[PDB]
């Protein structure tokens, strides 16, 4: 096991032997990997085309070093709403808005997230501008989830030993297999999720990883390129249920949604994006609401897949009903208020 061996195999376009991807990530996280080695490995794996085995190994190492939540503190049916980012469109924070709404429908949510990478305001930037605490440690994220119905795991706080890899990722400024790893390494390990993938060529592999750990996940790619379920056109969904993956194309027109234009979903700085969260939770009708409800419903469909009695059309119809109701009743707006108060009450 060594860098020349592993890098040599990748550059010869061969899949890694079992344990090699794991060995490599473990080196990255114990500080025994040079930035050049980290970059070479990220790039070579990408051009070879990563397998689910390899990417699962990498995320496995990461999770094996992540700060876990206290035992018996994350409900068996908790869901995440998170994406790779890197979609190149400056959007409002559809995942963070959908998460709030999903929690308010009564589904426990433990969202993994981070500050912006290639946009003006990431999930964490926006939650912060709203007055939500993005700085909580495990014991306090667990309390948030118990008391409020939602917790936020700020990726850097829970994965401090990934710091070198995250730096190299940003130094290279080209998407690689490493861009998959955030959504795959929520430290609370929820079993369900709506998982956005910006990179169409990698979403299948991502779904393979969720499939191996028997998650109930919808891996989503907007056909306009969004790492979210889009309203401008169709979305490609890799539906992961009972250890397998099937590829579906989803059309919001089937559920009465008008086509939107990308520029209608455009976001701004943290303050702009925060005001957009408030306008949606306050009942403002239009494109942004439609996209939040659609994404919230996809998370709820994922949640329902944990039972496997679940049927695709009734699921979506229930998801939409529940998501819209959570906004309409004020539950979602009140949930955000209660989330803010919780963090201020220490």
Ligand X SMILES: O=C(O)c1ccccc1Nc1ccccc1C(=O)O
For tokens 């009942």, the residue is: 283
Using the rule CB under 6 A, is 287 a contact of ligand X?
A: no
To ligand PRP, the closest distance from the beta carbon of 239 in angstroms equals 19
Is 233 exposed, middle or buried, given 0-12, 13-18 or 19+ CB atoms closer than 10 A? middle
One residue of 27, 73, 119, 186 binding ligand PRP per CB under 6 A: 119
CB 210 within 8 A of CB 217: yes
127 is in an annotated binding site: no
Using the rule CB under 6 A, is 144 a contact of ligand PRP?
A: no
Using the rule CB under 6 A, is 156 a contact of ligand X?
A: yes
Q: Which two tokens stand for residue 307?
A: 């039972």
CB 101 within 8 A of CB 214: no
Helix (H) or strand (E) holding 39: helix 35-48
- Identify the DSSP state of 162: G
95 is in an annotated binding site: yes
286 is in an annotated binding site: no
**Rounded-to-integer distance, Cα 24 and Cα 3, Å:** 8
One residue of 1, 18, 47, 314 binding a copy of itself per CB under 8 A: 47
228 is in an annotated binding site: yes
Q: Which two tokens stand for residue 35?
A: 């930035």
CB neighbours (10 Å) of residue 253? 11
- Rank residues 259 and 344 by Cβ distance to ligand X and give the closer one: 344
Site for Mg ion in 227-256 (CB under 5 A): 227-228
167 binds, among Mg ion, a copy of itself, ligand PRP, none (CB under 5 to 8 A by kind): a copy of itself
To ligand X, the closest distance from the beta carbon of 163 in angstroms equals 4
To ligand PRP, the closest distance from the beta carbon of 60 in angstroms equals 20
Sign of the C-alpha dihedral computed for residues 116, 122, 126 and 132 taken in this order: negative
To ligand PRP, the closest distance from the beta carbon of 143 in angstroms equals 21
Distances (CA, A) of 247 to 154, 172, 204, 236, 241: 30, 31, 8, 7, 12
For strand 216-222 and strand 235-241, is the pairing parallel, antiparallel, or unpaired? antiparallel
Taking residues 130 to 169 in sequence order and writing x for each that binds a copy of itself by CB under 8 A, - otherwise, the string is -------------------------------------xx-
To ligand X, the closest distance from the beta carbon of 16 in angstroms equals 20
13 is in an annotated binding site: no
Using the rule CB under 8 A, is 254 a contact of a copy of itself?
A: no
- Rank residues 138 and 319 by Cβ distance to ligand X and give the closer one: 138
Is 285 exposed, middle or buried, given 0-12, 13-18 or 19+ CB atoms closer than 10 A? exposed
CB 308 within 8 A of CB 192: no
Please compute Rg for the chain using Cα positions: 19
Residue ranges in contact with a copy of itself by CB under 8 A: 2-4, 7-8, 11, 13, 34-40, 42-44, 46-48, 167-168, 171-176
Residue ranges in contact with ligand X by CB under 6 A: 82, 84-85, 112-114, 135, 154-157, 159-160, 162-163, 166, 169, 178-179, 181-183, 185
Residue ranges in contact with ligand PRP by CB under 6 A: 82-83, 85-87, 93-96, 113-114, 116-119, 122-123, 182, 196
């Amino acid at each position: 096991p060594s860098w020349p061996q592993i890098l040599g195999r990748l550059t010869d376009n061969r899949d890694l032997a079992r344990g090699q991807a794991a060995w490599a990530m473990d080196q990255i996280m114990t500080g025994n990997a040079r930035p050049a080695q980290i970059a070479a490995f990220a790039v070579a794996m990408t051009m070879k085309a990563p397998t689910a085995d390899e990417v699962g190994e990498l995320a496995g190492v990461m999770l094996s070093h992540a700060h876990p939540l206290p035992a018996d503190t994350v409900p068996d049916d908790a869901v995440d709403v998170v994406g790779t980012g890197g979609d190149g469109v400056n959007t409002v924070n559809l995942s963070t808005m959908a998460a709030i709404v999903v929690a308010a429908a009564g589904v426990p949510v433990v969202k993994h997230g981070n500050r912006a990478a290639s946009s003006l305001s990431g999930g964490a930037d926006t939650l912060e501008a709203l007055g939500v605490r993005i700085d909580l440690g495990p014991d306090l994220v667990a309390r948030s989830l118990a008391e409020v119905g939602i917790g936020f795991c700020f990726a850097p706080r829970f994965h401090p030993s990934y710091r070198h890899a995250a730096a190299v990722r940003r130094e290279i400024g080209v998407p690689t297999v490493f861009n998959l790893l955030g959504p795959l390494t929520n430290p609370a390990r929820p079993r369900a999720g709506l998982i956005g993938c910006a990179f169409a060529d990698l979403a299948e592999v991502m779904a393979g990883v969720f499939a191996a750990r028997r998650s109930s996940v919808l891996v989503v790619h907007g056909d306009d390129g969004l790492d979210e379920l889009t309203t401008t056109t169709t979305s490609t969904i890799w539906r992961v249920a009972a250890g397998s993956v099937d590829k579906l194309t989803f059309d919001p027109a089937g559920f009465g949604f008008a086509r939107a234009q990308l520029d209608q979903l455009a976001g701004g700085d943290a303050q702009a994006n925060a005001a957009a969260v408030r306008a949606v939770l306050g009942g403002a009708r239009g494109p942004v609401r439609d996209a939040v409800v659609l994404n919230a419903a996809g998370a709820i469909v994922a949640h329902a897949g944990l039972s496997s009695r679940a049927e695709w059309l009734p699921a979506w119809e229930e998801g939409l009903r529940r998501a819209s109701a959570a906004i309409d009743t004020g539950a979602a707006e009140q949930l955000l208020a209660r989330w803010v108060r919780f963090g201020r009450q220490i």
